[PDB]
Amino acid sequence: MLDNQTILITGGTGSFGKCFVRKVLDTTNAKKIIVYSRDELKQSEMAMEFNDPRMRFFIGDVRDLERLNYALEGVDICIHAAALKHVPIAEYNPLECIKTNIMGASNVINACLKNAISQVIALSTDKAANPINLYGATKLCSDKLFVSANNFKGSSQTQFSVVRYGNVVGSRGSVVPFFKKLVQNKASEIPITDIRMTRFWITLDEGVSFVLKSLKRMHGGEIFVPKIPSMKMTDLAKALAPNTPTKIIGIRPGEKLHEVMIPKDESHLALEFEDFFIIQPTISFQTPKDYTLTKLHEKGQKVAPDFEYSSHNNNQWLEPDDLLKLL
Amino acid sequence: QNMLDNQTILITGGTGSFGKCFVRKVLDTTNAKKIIVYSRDELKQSEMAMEFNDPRMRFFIGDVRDLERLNYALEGVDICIHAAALKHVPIAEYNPLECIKTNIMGASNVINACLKNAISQVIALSTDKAANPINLYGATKLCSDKLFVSANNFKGSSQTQFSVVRYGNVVGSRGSVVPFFKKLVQNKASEIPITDIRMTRFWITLDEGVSFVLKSLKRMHGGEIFVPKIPSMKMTDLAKALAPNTPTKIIGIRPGEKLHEVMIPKDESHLALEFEDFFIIQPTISFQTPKDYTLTKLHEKGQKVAPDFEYSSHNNNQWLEPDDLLKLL
Amino acid sequence: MLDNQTILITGGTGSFGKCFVRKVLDTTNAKKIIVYSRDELKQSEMAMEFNDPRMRFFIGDVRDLERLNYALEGVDICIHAAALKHVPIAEYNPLECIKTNIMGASNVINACLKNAISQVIALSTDKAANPINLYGATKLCSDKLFVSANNFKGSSQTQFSVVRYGNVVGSRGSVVPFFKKLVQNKASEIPITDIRMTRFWITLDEGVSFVLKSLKRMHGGEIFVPKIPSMKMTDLAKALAPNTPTKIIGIRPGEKLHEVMIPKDESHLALEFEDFFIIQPTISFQTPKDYTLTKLHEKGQKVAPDFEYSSHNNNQWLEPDDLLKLL
Amino acid sequence: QNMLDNQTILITGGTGSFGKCFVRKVLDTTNAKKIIVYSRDELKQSEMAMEFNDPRMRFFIGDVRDLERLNYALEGVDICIHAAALKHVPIAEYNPLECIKTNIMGASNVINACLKNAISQVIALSTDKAANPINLYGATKLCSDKLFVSANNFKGSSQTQFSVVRYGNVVGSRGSVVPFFKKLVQNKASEIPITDIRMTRFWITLDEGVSFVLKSLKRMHGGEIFVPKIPSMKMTDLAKALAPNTPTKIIGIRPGEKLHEVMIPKDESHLALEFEDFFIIQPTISFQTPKDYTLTKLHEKGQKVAPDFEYSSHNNNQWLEPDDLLKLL
Amino acid sequence: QNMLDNQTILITGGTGSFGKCFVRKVLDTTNAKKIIVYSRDELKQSEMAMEFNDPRMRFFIGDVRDLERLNYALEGVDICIHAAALKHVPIAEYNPLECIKTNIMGASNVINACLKNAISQVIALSTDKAANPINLYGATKLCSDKLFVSANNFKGSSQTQFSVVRYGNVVGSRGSVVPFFKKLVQNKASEIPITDIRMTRFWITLDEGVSFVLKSLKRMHGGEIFVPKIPSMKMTDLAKALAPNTPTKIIGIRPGEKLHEVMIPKDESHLALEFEDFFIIQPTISFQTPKDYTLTKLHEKGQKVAPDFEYSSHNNNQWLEPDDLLKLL
Amino acid sequence: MLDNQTILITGGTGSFGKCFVRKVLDTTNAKKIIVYSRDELKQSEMAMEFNDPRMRFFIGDVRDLERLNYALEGVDICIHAAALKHVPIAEYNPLECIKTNIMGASNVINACLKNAISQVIALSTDKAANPINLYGATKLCSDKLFVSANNFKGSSQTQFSVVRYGNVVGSRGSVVPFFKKLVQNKASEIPITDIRMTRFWITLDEGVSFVLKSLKRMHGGEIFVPKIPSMKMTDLAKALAPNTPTKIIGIRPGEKLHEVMIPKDESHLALEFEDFFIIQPTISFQTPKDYTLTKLHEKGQKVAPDFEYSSHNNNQWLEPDDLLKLL
Ligand SMILES: NC(=O)c1ccc[n+]([C@@H]2O[C@H](COP(=O)([O-])OP(=O)(O)OC[C@H]3O[C@@H](n4cnc5c(N)ncnc54)[C@H](OP(=O)(O)O)[C@@H]3O)[C@@H](O)[C@H]2O)c1
């Protein structure tokens, strides 16, 4: 697997960013881990915490093609986690979200090919499946680009895969942590936008690991989807602090009732496995790939024609307590 | 008596299906100062100036990907129709940045330019595929719509209005399938492509839409996404039409090709406002200057819709008999 | 010659475009033929007609440098036929014509060098010789650039030559076909701008072949000119449909009486051959070339000091019938 | 009494031959608010501010290839003289994109900028070499002229006028041959470069032209290409001048160097309009606002020319005795 | 009664130290129509809209490196505060183009945009490090200041005024050392970083400065570089403060880190104009419209300074007792 | 040392430009010397004077990245002397100076890495030390960039060093030559801005040689400073023409009393040698370098803590005559 390799991750100062740097640091022999991002304050703060010579911090934007080409020189593997993810903000700053996510993905793809990187994994989201909001629309474009990149074939081959998973239990500005800062500062209530608000749930750590495993499976072109549990927002408001009331607030700008992981119209392209899924590409590559046998010799089978992985039509569900056991 | 009296109109990509018809319909039914055709191809542009040979026409070579050009293009324009785009779904799947550069950046430039020149009203053309999309093409179009709607916040003494008209397939449009169904049974009728037996699609006429735009243009406030109520046509039947009897062949689902097109999402119904013959999906954001979309600028009143409604082609009420289409062919 | 090679042709959806793709398909072992152009409707229509796995369609503009670099990866030979050729339109859209033809030629030249292509042939026109209209002015710049490209010398050598020939008998929006669509739709007349209107004439097929032969001759830097026949526009109006009258119409915007192939002031740089000519470069290359012995061991001699290849001062002439035999 | 009263003038590349003279001529004979010199080189610009030391001067460092800069440059200008360019023919042959970037894109930016700032009149400098060209330099200049003339269509409340002044060699200009003929017989007279015995060229004075511009500036409508009637000087004679007797040497025809310069094409004569001391090649296209180029804005009337006319240097009527030039040296 | 009455203010990078405080101070003490926060990070922007939850706020995602965006940003703004920047000296040393792209090109775009939108007054934030600099960061800031001052020449009916406010360290600002001195003795007090025993620095309060800007904003003409008179605090003492007693450790001089910060150069004193509580370094160039910087727009008179003066931190007169800082902490 | 190498120098039509081309031409076996600059008139004039096939003139701007990449193909060593150096003009055209000097330096750095050049020497100035004027501020950024470039490490290594020296005795538009053109044209006076105006002095030739030697010493990352003499402007006005009076004129826009070569706060990073100095980098390179032993096995030692190389606190001084002996 990974050994004496160089890894560059865009937006490595983010949640997935550090939780991933940490895990690669501790569980692998990655010769050098490179964080590529824009803020000097987070990288100054992040260099002092990860006080290890295995690191290296490059200040740069993904909207910058030259910089990326410079930053990716000599890199072996690349994880793309840079992005504007705040759905409401994206609705008010649509070009900003487009520049960062779409153009950003394109430049990363380019710089990777030029530097002959070996493997690239971009981070998607369930919001990119049958999307309604801008953020998701841009992300779907990003996935489309990354999958399509597997067609280029220069004097250097590069595999481009995508990992798509749900809401990361408690993250920089989320819900579960929000539903505590309140009760702490005397929360007058517990706002619940709706009773049907379902959502796939995964942890920072579960995510970081499904990624490092995809690298071990991937042929390039796949869109790996993990089989994660769903949790009714009704049974979550409880845990967090049933005590206080729950003033319904309606619906934020761009929210869905439930999130989709694998569209119904994607069924055919799906292949079930044990812990995960794979949404085979839609286009054909000059060099065909057999997405039925991972590079880990794991065998996967198709799915029923009327297949779809909704957040609610799911069968797994996080007990109204389990999320406290995780807190 | 509402009209586009003595006005300069510019339509991007008006060298194709929608464009040629809209350019014809406007010259015929309205008295607009002039009409500018903005497109890249010199052949089509030349074979259009002849085709029309009308003094109220002007032709500009140009790419929507070009901002300095669009800036000079729109100079002196009152109304802009954005119909330029890459719509060939499977090709968009293989050439994703192309589709992105034209449809996403393209929409952005047309906007940037329209505002610079203080255009009055702008209507952008979307597709049913931009609703809960799954193919790249549709995803760029969803982005596109978002941009034009978001464009309504900008507040300068320009006050441009941006709206979107989203509808489905056009009964035999510039190289599609209807003609590619004749074209075949119009040569060696013995093999007809198919994908599914449940495969449905909304079908509007290359004219029902054109007029729908001119109409949406007359009753807009800005920020709307007008949806024309149309009939759904299950493919199977659409088969016996362009070939009463022939050995059809079930090829395969082309890349990124859905199975049931959505016109209005299930998760956005709370934004829709039903009307007698059309729909209006209100902005998912709030503008500085709010508006009551329940009242078209034509007075037309509107009531919302069932909090669960999902205007899908399959769950459509009306349909088209394999003869109602013959009455189109 | 060409074998197991990859060929990319800009504007391959055009007249010369398909007639060339077809001929390479049928007469060579070209491993892969790549069409590079902007319209999806022509490439969708062109893929279904040339239903052959030897093809590959890239949607792109020549005004786009990144795309070209991507498109030319792994290509062996490149034919440049993309361009805005409508003279009147170019007079009203001068920057458009300049961007496409000049900047377009420059980007193609660049992408070719970066990808180490071996041979590049750009298509010129007689309108580029002692030009008067914009279209021709841009084309002369394109020829100048391509010839000059033979001076670059990186870890990869690339030959850049130009093929310059006249009006292609009946083409997408021309005269001879125009002078029939009329008589068909009851042509009231036959418009003849002038009695001296001479023009070199060649066929789509003759052109496509002189190109594939130049590749076999070329050293890089030459501007091959075929010896084609001239035809008085007076004796052409006849054939097409003498029947109807000929309402003289004057002179279109930018038209010449006759077209030049090899300028008088180019004499010195000329070298006569059997079927063709060669207009040796004006500049000297780091690595001299002997344009007297093609790579086909064909020997050519200079021309008289007062030499010039006008369309009228020519000696060959297409009988007022021959063009019907060709129709 | 026509003047450039209290006006701001900006000349691109006015740090060279034409520029320095025009800058001098305008300060001396007219009362224009100010004069802006726009060029790249700091040395020449500094050695010019001293050289002139005039308060009505302003110097801006800048490349015509730079659009944002040109935009700030022309801000507040009424008249623009575009004299910036790469004219060294053989060098242009070896560095074709350079010449292209400066002469073609350069002309485009100066235009884009002039219109943005609503400049009143713009005169661009062309060369005889842009007539039925064969060298790159001249070909960029033909493109250039086309651009400035085409620039007259644009219709905004700016109404800028764009014209072109095309003439030949300037009797001993910034490093040419006349001085490089002295410079030699001005050191070791024993070897003089030559190309042909029929080699002819039009010759105007670095002052006859400058004034011709100021004049063309006073009688323009826009879209014209003014041609100054000048004398032709067969090289041979021009030899005995800058060296009565010396062993000249026939080197060789430099790259892209013609043998007979054309001022007006044979295929464009039908556009020319002959005048007492100059010519006017009318646009090869039609503008929205037509104009009668037969009447200079100075009332000067004009009759066309013989439908075959080809103002060539060799077929020129007047010439220059090997002493008329001495009366220039 | 001077105020920023009913005015739209936009501050670049107002999502950080200075910004948040300035945004707070202005809302609290003045009645300005609205306030626009222009920055790149969505997290900080969201955690600020909540943090403030004030209707007179607006947040725009954006990079100062982006000119088209800045152009739309500043649209409709009267006053602009440029506080966006990369200031982490040693990081700037390792990523020099980054710092350059943001601080140099960044300042240029904010200017280009401000003029385009006819902003009234613009104040740019500089640092003491831009005085006789040696580190990249400070060198970009010197360039930066030069740009904003030079920006005062441009003369269009816009008449924007550009000034600069340059001061030193901010007593415990967004991750610096003061807090990183607590943070340590606030966990395992046994090792404190040090560089020299002569190491001095000027120290102003994150509030003394903010107000200084609002004040400099009220008494500016344009082209000035306002310098606030502040106290110097020799580091040694600053040590016993954030840790009465602990085993400090002399690590090493971080890259590009000076030893004595300069507020006013020795070679520029002849430009300074001393005031009761501040300084004004006049432009090193002459503008078309001269100004008497000896008279603030607040009437405040000013006398120059000793022709040798060099406002250095070490040669400072006033200082701060290791308790005056405690009275800050 | 240098042999069969290719050298490209930006702004080779300048003072240092020709004096360097000449010296490399005469004292080395440089296979090919390439001049890269913008003006055709200087390069036309410069090709005729340096009438040697070892030359090659490329017309280009440093503000142009493509061109540079083209121009630097196959180059071994690169000297960067292009720049806007007129301090007053830079104060009025600050963006022009920034584009040329800073962006220019960045593009040169980029093109060099892409072409795998081996060594690059950029020319600094004493004005970049503790600067006050724009010109110097941009130059300090240029030095910072060049030093930092030594961190990139692609499939090709490139050393980037800087040479920083004072006013070049009599140059295109300077003082000493100015103080003669006057007396020649009847100089009414001798303007002396101040009595303390000190300045380091070096010759075109001394400079050109310290450069060619640095190439022989350099490890990459150094900022070589030669130990040159200082001259009081009071004792210089004399020589030039004591005869005429000396009307004091004040202080130009951006001038200092004295110029610094090695800042006081740079002491620690300094290393004294015989004829020169070295200001070790401020940052650490992935691959450490020992700046105490040049590549010429020359040993250098540090300097006292209170060290600084001012133009006045200097000990060497050019006799009020020596500059006439040099004239
Ligand atoms: N005399 C002739 O041979 C002749 C005859 C007919 C027509 N013309 C035309 O008249 C015009 C002026 O000729 P001239 O004899 O005065 O030539 P010149 O002495 O070479 O002056 C040309 C000027 O253009 C400037 N320039 C060059 N590139 C520039 C750029 N990229 N951006 C901005 N300025 C640039 C140069 O200034 P910097 O180098 O400091 O940038 C120079 O001052 C030319 O356009 C030429 O085509 C010349």
Find the residue in A nearest to B152 (Cα).
A92
Q: Cβ separation of E72 and B156 shorter than 8 Å?
A: no
Mutation for testing the E interface, residue in F134, F151, F285, F308 having most E CBs under 10 Å: F134
Six-digit token string for E19: 């910004």
Residue C172 backbone dihedrals phi, psi, to 5 degrees: -40, 95
Cα–Cα distance list, A55 to B245, B285, F289 (Å): 69, 42, 21
Strand partners, A43: none
d(CA A286, CA B231): 40
Of the residues B34, B101, B129, B258, only one is catalytic, namely B129
Query: D230 CB less than 6 Å from ligand 1?
Result: no
Which of F38, F42, F46, F100 to probe ligand 1 with, by most ligand atoms within 8 A of CB? F38
Q: What is the DSSP string of F212-225?
A: HHHHHH--SS-EEE
CB pairs under 8 A between A and B: 92
Q: Helices E208-218 & E17-29, crossing angle to 10 degrees?
A: 60
Using an 8 Å CB-CB cutoff, list chain D residues near B68: 112
Rounded Cα distance between A276 and A271, Å, is 9
Strands (E), E13-108: 34-39, 57-61, 79-82
List B10's β-bridge partners, or say none: B36, B80
Experimental structure resolution, Å: 2.8
Q: Does A178 touch chain F (CB under 8 A)?
A: no
Query: Measured in whole angstroms, how far is the alpha carbon of residue B236 from the centre of its chain?
Result: 25
The encoded tokens of residue A200 equal: 């796939």
Nearest to A183 by CA among A238, A241, A236, A234: A241
Residue located nearest, by CA, to atom 28 of ligand 1: D85
Domain ranges in chain B are: 1-168+205-229+262-312, 169-204+230-261+313-329
How many cross-chain Cβ pairs, D to F, lie less than 8 Å apart?
52
Burial of B180 from C-beta contacts in 10 A (0-12 / 13-18 / 19+): middle
Max Cα–Cα distance, chain C, nearest Å: 63
Name the minimum distance, in Å, from the CA of B7 to any CA of chain A: 31
Using DSSP's 3-state secondary structure scheme, residue F278 falls into strand
Q: Which residues of A touch E60 (CB under 8 A)?
A: 93
Q: What residues of F are labeled active site? A: 127
- What is the least distance, in Å, from the CA of D152 to any CA of chain B? 13
Task: Give the 3-state secondary structure percentages of chain C, helix then strand then coil, rounded to 5.
Answer: 35, 20, 45
CB atoms within 10 A of CB F310: 20
Measured in Å, residue D87 CA sits from the centre of ligand 1 at: 7
Q: Which residues from A are below 8 Å from C70, CB to CB?
A: 152
Question: What is the dotted CATH code of the domain comprising B169-204+230-261+313-329?
Answer: 3.90.25.30
Q: What letter represents residue B252's amino acid?
A: G
Task: Assess C94–D contact: CB distance below 8 Å, yes or no.
Answer: yes
CB contact under 8 Å between D156 and B72, yes or no, is no
C-alpha distance across the termini of chain B, in Å: 33
Whether A181 is catalytic: no
Both tokens of E254, joined, read 């971080």
Nearest alpha carbon, ligand 1 atom 32: D63
Atom number of ligand 1 nearest to Cα D41: 40
Sign of the CA dihedral F132, F133, F139, F141? positive
Most A CBs within 10 A among E37, E39, E43, E251, hence the mutation to make, goes to E43
Subunits adjacent to chain C (3 or more Cβ pairs under 8 Å): A, B, D, F
Helical ranges in F72-133 per DSSP H: 87-92, 94-98, 104-114
Would you say the CB of residue D196 lies under 6 angstroms from ligand 1?
no
Q: CB neighbours of D66 closer than 8 A, spacing ≥ 6?
A: D109
**Pocket perturbation via mutation, ligand 1, pick of D40, D59, D66, D102 by most ligand atoms within 8 A of CB:** D40
Asked if A152 reaches chain C (Cβ–Cβ under 8 Å), the answer is yes
Closest CA to E158 of E106, E110, E121, E213: E121
Tell if the CB–CB gap between D72 and E154 is shorter than 8 Å.
Answer: yes
CB spacing of E45 vs A89 below 8 angstroms: yes
Instruction: Tell whether ligand 1 has an atom less than 6 A from the beta carbon of residue D109.
Output: no
Q: What is the torsional sign of CA C204, C206, C207, C211?
A: positive
Tell whether ligand 1 has an atom less than 6 A from the beta carbon of residue D223.
Answer: no
Residue B91: enclosing H or E segment and its boundaries? helix B89-94
Q: Domain E1-168+205-229+262-312's class?
A: alpha beta
**D39 ligand 1 Cβ < 6 A:** yes
C143 in a known ligand binding site: no
User: What is d(CA F209, CA A41) in angstroms, rounded to the nearest whole number?
Assistant: 45
Residue with tokens 């090997």: D322
Q: Are E176 and E140 in contact (CB under 8 A)?
A: no
Interface with B, mutate which of A283, A284, A302 (most B CBs under 10 A): A283
Token code pair at residue C65: 């440098």
What span, in angstroms and rounded, lies between the C-alpha atoms of E57 and E74?
14
Residue of chain E with shortest Cα separation from B109: E68
Q: Measure the CA–CA gap between E134 and F264, rounded to whole angstroms.
A: 10
Q: Measured between alpha carbons, how far is F80 from F36 in angstroms, rounded to an integer?
A: 10
- Name the phi and psi angles at B249, rounded to 5: -130, 125
Experimental method: X-ray
Question: Does ligand 1 lie within 6 Å of residue D85's CB atom?
Answer: yes
The CATH code of domain A167-202+228-259+311-327 reads 3.90.25.30
From the CA of D112, how far away is ligand 1's center (Å)?
20
Q: Which residue on chain A is closest to C67 by alpha carbon?
A: A110
Q: What is the DSSP letter of F150?
A: G
Task: State how far the Cα of D225 lies from the Cα of F272, in Å rounded to an integer.
Answer: 67
Q: Which residue of D has its CA nearest to E151?
A: D72
Stretch 38-67 of chain F: residues touching chain E, C-beta under 8 Å: none
Ligand 1 touching residue D63 (CB < 6 A) = yes
By CB neighbour count within 10 A (0-12 exposed, 13-18 middle, 19+ buried), where does C13 fall? Answer: buried
Residue numbers in A near E98 (CB within 8 A): 59-60, 67
> Are B100 and A143 spatial neighbours (Cβ–Cβ below 8 Å)?
no
A1-166+203-227+260-310: what fold? Rossmann fold (3.40.50)
User: What does residue F29 show for φ and ψ, rounded to 5 degrees?
Assistant: -115, 30
Alpha-carbon torsion angle B28, B29, B31, B37, nearest 10: -60
For ligand 1, say whether the CB of D22 is within 6 Å of any of its atoms.
Answer: no
Task: Give the one of F39, F59, F84 whose C-beta lies nearest to D61's C-beta.
Answer: F84
Helix (H, G, I), strand (E, B) or coil at D194: strand
Tokens in use for B168?
């489905």
Helix (H, G, I), strand (E, B) or coil at C73: coil
Question: CB of A75 within 8 A of CB of A33?
Answer: no
Closest CA to B169 of B212, B138, B128: B128
Q: What is the token pair recorded at C46?
A: 């062109």
In this structure, are residues F178 and F185 in contact, taking their beta carbons and an 8 Å threshold?
Answer: no
Q: CB-based contact (8 Å) between F327 and chain E?
A: no
Nearest in space to C180 (alpha carbons), one of C244, C87, C85: C244
Kindly give, in sequence order, each residue whose CB lies less than 8 Å from that of residue E215, ignoring residues fewer than 6 positions away: none
Cβ of A282 and B97 within 8 Å?
no
Task: Look up residue C24 and give its two tokens.
Answer: 């390479």
